[PDB]
Design an enzyme around this catalytic site. Structure first.
Site, PDB file in Angstrom:
ATOM      1  N   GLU A 114       4.712   5.104  11.644  1.00 59.37           N
ATOM      2  CA  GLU A 114       3.265   4.887  11.747  1.00 59.37           C
ATOM      3  C   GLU A 114       2.909   3.904  12.863  1.00 59.37           C
ATOM      4  OE1 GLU A 114       2.466   6.100   7.115  1.00 59.37           O
ATOM      5  OE2 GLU A 114       1.956   4.064   7.791  1.00 59.37           O
ATOM      6  N   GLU A 121       0.832  -1.209   0.000  1.00 63.03           N
ATOM      7  CA  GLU A 121       0.000   0.000   0.000  1.00 63.03           C
ATOM      8  C   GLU A 121       0.857   1.246   0.000  1.00 63.03           C
ATOM      9  OE1 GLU A 121      -3.275   1.050   3.164  1.00 63.03           O
ATOM     10  OE2 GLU A 121      -1.779   2.660   2.912  1.00 63.03           O
TER      11      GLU A 121
END
Ligand code: HEM
Ligand code: HEM
Ligand code: HEM
Ligand code: HEM
Ligand code: UQ2
Ligand code: UQ2
Lengths: 57, 446, 54, 105, 53, 54, 423, 49, 146, 54
Positions: free
Chosen positions: B137, B60
């Site tokens: 993240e 992604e």
């Protein structure tokens, strides 16, 4: 092309009966989650984002 | 003036068509000048090994950073210049890449989607930049108590199964995943019969078809055969994970029984019962007068900051329950009331509240399907899980059939005297012991 | 006060043989005890409320 | 209107005087028994009335303690007897009754 | 003034609790019977004829 | 609120035998407190029945 | 095969009220009463009154007790929400078609027959503090509230959130006064979605004929300028630099909107470099690591604030701000393409069309338009208006920003954040 | 990083009917509660006597 | 801080300084709310080591003798290794801070840069202060000379 | 802190006979509660001494 808030920028609060209190117009933030370290609480004295009264089966 | 019932019939039938690939191409034509196109893929993390975990999340990140026909940043430049928006997501069971753009731009939007989903340039320098991005993240996601608890709940409920894994993977995998790892995962999963090109808005279905043959012809045709496994069932366990941390100021708790999967007809009755319990948040107007007894008792007695019921669906299983956020001295009262509501519904559910549940559910369904984006998503996801697009009229029929008897029978089946998966984080000294949470799952009155 | 007075009657009768006067007065006092507590006292409360326009 | 109404009115006045809360400067509404409906009405009173109501009760409990009573001129006169609580009580009941109707369906 | 508990929901409530109130009474009965050894009631039960005649 | 936690009488019970925070590692040796409790009642009960004939 | 659509029906009543409705053959309905009653109508003696009011939508009304409003709306699974901006308050109500009637009634009751009972209003005061705390956890909200306080001396300076000193002090009489003088026919618009024009028009003629309040769109916002600085220690400095631009509806406003896209609003790609964003690339070039930038554009009935907003580490604030400011200067000196303005036009048009894709976005646009313009402008003509904006108009807007007296708000550890003086 | 949070293997403690990650637990649930409740039922019967 | 801030003057003068300077004199005499609970032992140590030094100090005595103070200073006050002069230099800037309050009484202060202490101009300002008017001299007076 | 107010045992006493907020106007008629208390103890004490010979 009116609708001050949607013309992006100025702030627009929402209050509700069944939905949630929103504060949400335009400024940066979104391109700070990418060059990262844009933290956030995880519900420190809060409420909850994404909000509810949408679903499916 | 048309009735509600009549309006459900007016919604244009979603048109479904198959390519000589396995690529399903579906669309719901409306009159809007804007649209949303995307590719839904039967790839998640429930498909991953252990060493591998984080693979799709990693793809992604690389997906929009360069293709072979469009290098480094060229793609961004095209999407942005036509004013379009390109986004993507990935759960434990699904991956999506969608473009939200003007209707004229449909040719280009499909063409870009194709390029991204097939001719991806996982260039070494970029895959190396992305490992720092993803680790950051992970550091960020750690601060979100809510995201943490749902990962904990999955990890305990689905103990030794692939479903116990998070989407992003463990840090050790993020720093070690190779280009070979990624390319292999792409080869295995990003193939035609497992993808669906979905669209919604001002498009005619033939356009979509033409575009699908034009830019997606070149997948599964000369492919498939041996090396295509199915999904193995995931044992639900029923246990508890408590992450005590008195430094955080509010406790997060998530409790759930095993739900049935996507396919099961009884997700409708569960959603009605969940709706009756509903949700709460400290910014809701209406405290004491809220219909839902949990919500009402929570507001007056100030037993929480927020709570939400949920019904998460996976292949043949799911998590059904609630999550809440509260002060250290309110975890016990909160649980008592939550559990009290499940049993009440299991045994003594009444008719009026069931109509409210059904009504809340009819509004949620329709309010959600508003805009090209949620509908496009709905088409893509449906086809992956239902094989069909379930029209609103049918969902209505399924909702209409629910009465009190169904609620107390369907809630009983899933809740009554069943072991929950419990996940707690924060100041949890007062989270009730597992045996006591288990003893609150049945009632001695009954 | 009629309840207390009725309870004197009851004890007095209770300390007397079950022959003349005593049977019928002690019989009626018993009815009164229960008519008082069960019917008369409540009815009075309703009347009193009414006199006060409540 | 005539002879009869005055007779019921004088019977009411008579009971009032016999009831004797007036003798302790109390008003009728100061004597109401406190259930939830009433507890709420007291709560909803405005600052002034609430303060006056506490002083009256205090004045009476004090009198009641030393078993005295107020001079006759300071007794509260019937129908000069403001029923300050009534409208609040009425609305609180009306609110409860609506909750109750909703609870039946 | 018990007219507060008279309506469709309460009527639905009563019914949902009947099989339970009925089964609680069966428990109470057998429980009373077995604990006092209710001659009258017991003598009809096939086995448990430990009072011969 | 609950019923156990709030009721004046049940509170006492709750605070002594239900929600009482106890150490997770007490062993038999800690049982003799309840056993003395049982022995005390056992002594009282058989003790009373004996007093009915003694 | 989708059904051929319907046109929106629009009507100004002689008392000034506007009614707009669209019959989309939707399962649900949406009705909003838009009122010119935002915070700009508050003054020194009653600040926060429109906040408490916004939070008071479910208190008892004549004809509907609080309990009823809540239970009644929830029984059919609908919504009641109130949303405010510095100019408007909007009461929106949502439900399935078959239930419009009861929701309409509650709406009318909330907006035209509120009782604001002493005790219910006292119980609601603490909600201001909960509501305000939740909004204020986004650093942006403080910044934008201070930005406005700094820019104007007047009405637009007011906050959307009740000042702390007023929490607990706003009175039932102040709510009554705020409603009587702002919730009137000439300041109102009834918008409907999934209803029919006759019905809305009937409702408006029967229930919305209220008038005896104030008149126009203001006391008039007097732009002043200046700066507000809040020391914080947040690791990240938030700053907004702005100048007076143009009032909404005017041709110049569109020039500013196009300028906003030339420079850069939000992102279009998940986790992207933001190649077409002038501000972003300009800051990135000389700043290495965590940061964000975006143009800011607020447009009101009689004023406007345009500029940029930056998020950055405490020590890079000066550099980020200076790079950004210089980038605008560059466009003000003429260094603007043609395909750039073209790309910006496409970003602006695609986004507007995207903004009215759904019921919620459409209804809000129709309601706001009704208030600001007293008209309904179709998407075609809005696209046309955008196209009329020339490159020189964009250049001129940039030039207006560069030389206009500035306004600025900033929060964080401000040790390296410049003062305007220093820009 | 909270993503590293393992869930320790419990095979050492799991009843035999719940040893496979490959299949449902719902199947053996009834037998499992059955067995554990039978124990408490038999006990109460014992104590009753 | 709560006790000082009950005098409206203290907020005003703290904001007056924050408004006037961009620098050092802008700092408040009271800890900013966000710092309460956050100042560290290391920060106190650092503040002492670098400011409590010989060249920045003066030992004054009343009712003592010079030799004693001088002895004490030579034995115990020979500390030096901090910073140097009287500042980073206060850069006067100007501007205004406004705090909405509802107090029935408005407190306001209007000021401009004047002169540093010690300079001849400072005395001119002090005399100006008395021409205009400082505090009162008479209890409950009209303040004729003000 | 005091000693009466804090000690586990004395608390009970304090909360029942010392600092207990009582109405200022209760009359004789309210005395019978303590008098029953005395009668209960009097019955127990003379009752025990009789049991030593009965
Ligand atoms: C009628 C006689 C007694 C009764 C009913 C009684 C009852 C209890 C009970 C129920 C407990 C708590 C559970 C346990 O640890 O066993 C306990 C603990 C204790 N008792 Fe007793 N007990 C009695 C005699 C004694 C004696 C003779 C002593 C020693 C002089 C004693 C000193 C203690 C102490 C110190 C504890 C605390 C032990 C610990 O927590 O480790 N009690 N008792
Ligand atoms: C108030 C409850 C009690 C009552 C009413 C009671 C009454 C009696 C009576 C009537 C006897 C004579 C009958 C006999 O010898 O069997 C007796 C004997 C005795 N009791 Fe108790 N008693 C009570 C509690 C206790 C307690 C607390 C103890 C101490 C463990 C105790 C230990 C004894 C002993 C050792 C004997 C004599 C041994 C024997 O059983 O022959 N009893 N009791
Ligand atoms: C062993 C017998 C009793 C004892 C030791 C006992 C003790 C007391 C005590 C100490 C008080 C507080 C002081 C007072 O008002 O007198 C009291 C009040 C009260 N008792 Fe009893 N009493 C007993 C029997 C009763 C009976 C027979 C009743 C009626 C069924 C009763 C119902 C009450 C009530 C309602 C009060 C509250 C009275 C008030 O506050 O005005 N108790 N009692
Ligand atoms: C546990 C404490 C008590 C004990 C140990 C006790 C013991 C006795 C004994 C041994 C007798 C027979 C001796 C005699 O007749 O004088 C007796 C008689 C009696 N007691 Fe008690 N008793 C107690 C509490 C009570 C209570 C609570 C009452 C009820 C007010 C009560 C009322 C009577 C009466 C009416 C008699 C018979 C009349 C008489 O004195 O001849 N005693 N008691
Ligand atoms: C956490 O430690 C404790 C236990 O575990 C070792 C107990 O078992 C008990 C049991 C006590 C009982 C049942 C009360 C009996 C007393 C009487 C007068 C009948 C107590 C109090 C306790 O604190
Ligand atoms: C404020 O009202 C009260 C009194 O004034 C009327 C009392 O006099 C008493 C006296 C009670 C006593 C001394 C306890 C006796 C009980 C036993 C079991 C010996 C109590 C409790 C009370 O509440």
């Amino acid at each position: 092309m009116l609708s001050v808030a949607a013309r992006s920028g100025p702030f627009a609060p929402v209050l509700s009966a069944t939905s949630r209190g929103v504060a949400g117009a335009l400024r940066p933030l979104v391109q700070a989650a990418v060059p990262a370290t844009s933290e956030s609480p995880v519900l420190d004295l809060k409420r909850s984002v994404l909000c509810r009264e949408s679903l499916r089966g | 003036t048309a009735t509600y019932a009549q309006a459900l019939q007016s919604v244009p039938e979603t048109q479904v068509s198959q390519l000589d690939n396995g690529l399903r191409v579906a669309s719901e034509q409306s009159s809007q000048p804007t649209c949303t196109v995307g590719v839904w893929i039967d790839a998640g993390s429930r498909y991953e090994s252990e060493k591998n975990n984080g693979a799709g999340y990693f793809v992604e990140h690389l997906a929009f950073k360069g293709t072979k026909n469009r290098p480094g940043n060229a793609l961004e430049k095209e999407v942005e210049s036509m004013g379009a928006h390109l986004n993507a997501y990935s759960t434990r069971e699904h991956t999506a890449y969608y473009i939200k753009a003007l209707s004229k731009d449909l040719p280009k939007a499909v063409e870009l989607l194709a390029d991204i989903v097939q001719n991806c340039s996982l260039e070494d320098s970029q895959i190396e930049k992305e490992r720092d991005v993803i680790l950051q993240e992970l550091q960020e996601n750690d601060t979100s108590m809510r995201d943490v608890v749902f990962n904990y709940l999955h990890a305990t409920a689905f103990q030794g199964t692939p479903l116990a894994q998070s989407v992003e993977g463990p840090s050790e995998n993020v720093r070690k995943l190779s280009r070979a790892d990624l390319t292999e995962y792409l080869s295995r999963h990003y193939k035609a019969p497992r993808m669906v090109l979905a669209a919604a808005g001002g498009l005619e279905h033939r356009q979509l078809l033409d575009l699908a043959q034009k830019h997606f012809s070149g997948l599964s045709g000369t492919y498939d055969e041996d090396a295509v496994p199915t999904l193995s069932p995931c044992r639900f366990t029923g246990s508890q994970i408590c992450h005590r941390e008195d430094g955080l100021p509010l406790a997060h708790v998530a409790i759930a029984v095993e739900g049935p999967g996507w396919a099961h007809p009884d997700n409708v009755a569960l959603q009605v019962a969940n709706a009756i319990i509903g949700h709460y948040d400290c910014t809701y107007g209406g405290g004491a007068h809220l219909s839902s007894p949990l919500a009402s008792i929570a507001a007056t007695n100030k037993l929480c900051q927020s709570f939400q019921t949920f019904n998460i669906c996976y292949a043949d299983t799911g998590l059904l329950g609630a999550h809440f956020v509260c002060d250290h001295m309110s975890i016990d009262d909160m649980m008592f009331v939550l559990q009290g509501q499940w049993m009440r519904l299991c045994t003594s559910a009444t008719e009026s509240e069931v109509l409210r549940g059904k009504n809340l559910l009819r509004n949620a369904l329709v309010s959600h399907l508003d805009g090209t984006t949620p509908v496009c998503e709905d088409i893509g996801r449906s086809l992956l899980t239902y094989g069909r697009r379930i029209p609103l009229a049918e969902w209505e029929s399924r909702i209409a059939e629910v009465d009190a008897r169904v609620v107390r029978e369907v809630c009983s089946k899933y809740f009554y005297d069943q072991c929950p998966a419990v996940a707690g984080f924060g100041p949890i000294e007062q989270l009730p012991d597992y045996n006591r949470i288990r003893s609150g799952m049945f009632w001695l009155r009954f | 006060w009629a309840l207390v007075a009725d309870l004197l009657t009851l004890t007095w009768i209770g300390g007397q043989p079950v022959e003349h006067p005593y049977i019928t007065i002690g019989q009626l006092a018993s009815v009164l005890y229960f008519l008082l507590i069960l019917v008369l006292m409540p009815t009075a409360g309703t009347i009193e409320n009414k006199l006060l326009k409540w | 209107v005539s002879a009869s109404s005055r007779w019921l009115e004088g019977i009411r006045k008579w009971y009032y005087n016999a009831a004797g809360f007036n003798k302790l400067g109390l008003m009728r509404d100061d004597t109401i028994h406190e259930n939830d409906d009433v507890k709420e009405a007291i709560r909803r009173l405005p600052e002034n009335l609430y303060d006056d109501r506490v002083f009256r009760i205090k004045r009476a409990l004090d009198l009641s303690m030393r078993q005295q009573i107020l001079p006759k001129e300071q007794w509260t006169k019937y129908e000069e007897d403001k029923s300050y609580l009534e409208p609040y009580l009425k609305e609180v009941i009306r609110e409860r009754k609506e909750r109750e109707e909703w609870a039946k369906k | 003034m018990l007219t507060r508990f008279l309506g469709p929901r309460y009527r639905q409530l009563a019914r949902n609790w009947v099989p339970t109130a009925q089964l609680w009474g069966a428990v109470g009965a057998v429980g009373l019977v077995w604990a006092t050894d209710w001659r009258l009631i017991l003598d009809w039960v096939p086995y448990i004829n430990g009072k011969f005649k | 609120t609950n019923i156990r936690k709030s009721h004046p009488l049940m509170k006492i019970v709750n605070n002594a035998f239900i929600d009482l925070p106890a150490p997770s590692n007490i062993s038999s040796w800690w049982n003799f407190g309840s056993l003395l409790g049982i022995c005390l009642i056992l002594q009282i009960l058989t003790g009373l029945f004996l007093a009915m004939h003694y | 095969v989708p059904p051929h659509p319907q046109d929106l029906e629009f009507t100004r009543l002689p008392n000034g009220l506007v009614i707009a409705s669209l019959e989309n053959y939707a399962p649900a309905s949406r009705i909003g009463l838009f009122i010119k009653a935002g915070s700009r109508y508050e003054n020194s003696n009653n600040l926060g009154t429109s906040h408490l009011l916004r939070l008071a939508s479910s208190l008892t009304t004549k004809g509907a007790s609080s309990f009823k409003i809540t239970r009644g709306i929830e029984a059919v699974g609908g919504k009641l929400s109130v949303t405010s901006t510095r100019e408007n308050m909007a009461y929106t109500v949502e439900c399935l078609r078959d239930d419009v009637d009861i929701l309409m009634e509650f709406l009318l009751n909330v907006t035209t027959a509120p009782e604001f009972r002493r005790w219910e209003v006292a119980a609601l005061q603490p909600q201001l503090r909960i509501d305000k705390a939740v909004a204020l956890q986004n650093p942006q909200a403080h910044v934008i509230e201070n930005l406005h306080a700094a820019a104007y001396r007047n009405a637009l300076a007011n906050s959307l959130y009740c000042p702390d000193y007023r929490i607990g002090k706003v009175t039932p009489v102040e709510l009554h006064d705020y409603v009587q003088n702002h919730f009137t026919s000439a300041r109102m618009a009834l918008i409907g979605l999934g209803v029919s024009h006759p019905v809305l028009k009937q409702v408006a003629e029967q229930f919305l004929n209220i008038r005896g309040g104030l008149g126009l769109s203001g006391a008039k916002a007097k732009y002043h300028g200046g700066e507000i600085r809040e020391q914080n220690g947040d690791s990240l400095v938030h700053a907004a630099l702005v100048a007076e631009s143009a009032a909404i509806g005017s041709a110049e406003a569109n020039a500013f909107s196009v300028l906003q896209h030339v420079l850069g609003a939000g992102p279009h790609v998940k986790r992207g470099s933001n190649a077409t964003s002038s501000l972003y690339q300009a800051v990135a070039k000389g700043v290495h690591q965590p940061f964000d930038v975006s143009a800011f554009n607020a447009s009101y009935s009689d004023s406007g604030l345009f500029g940029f907003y930056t998020i950055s580490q405490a020590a890079s604030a000066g550099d980020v701000i200076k790079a950004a400011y210089n980038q605008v200067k560059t466009i003000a000196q003429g260094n603007l393409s043609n395909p750039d303005v073209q790309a910006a036009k496409n970003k602006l048009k695609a986004g507007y069309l995207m903004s009215v894709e759904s019921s919620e976005g459409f209804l809000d646009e129709v309601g706001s338009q009704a208030l600001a313009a007293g008209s309904y402008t179709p998407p075609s003509t809005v696209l046309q208006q955008i196209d009329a904006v020339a490159d020189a108009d964009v250049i001129n807007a940039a030039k207006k920003f560069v030389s206009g007296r500035k306004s600025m708000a900033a929060s964080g550890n401000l040790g390296h954040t410049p003062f305007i003086d220093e820009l | 990083s909270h993503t590293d949070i393992k869930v320790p293997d419990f095979s050492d403690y799991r009843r035999p009917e719940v040893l496979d990650s490959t299949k449902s637990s719902k199947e053996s649930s009834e037998a499992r509660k059955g067995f554990s409740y039978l124990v408490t039922a038999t006990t109460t019967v014992g104590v009753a006597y």
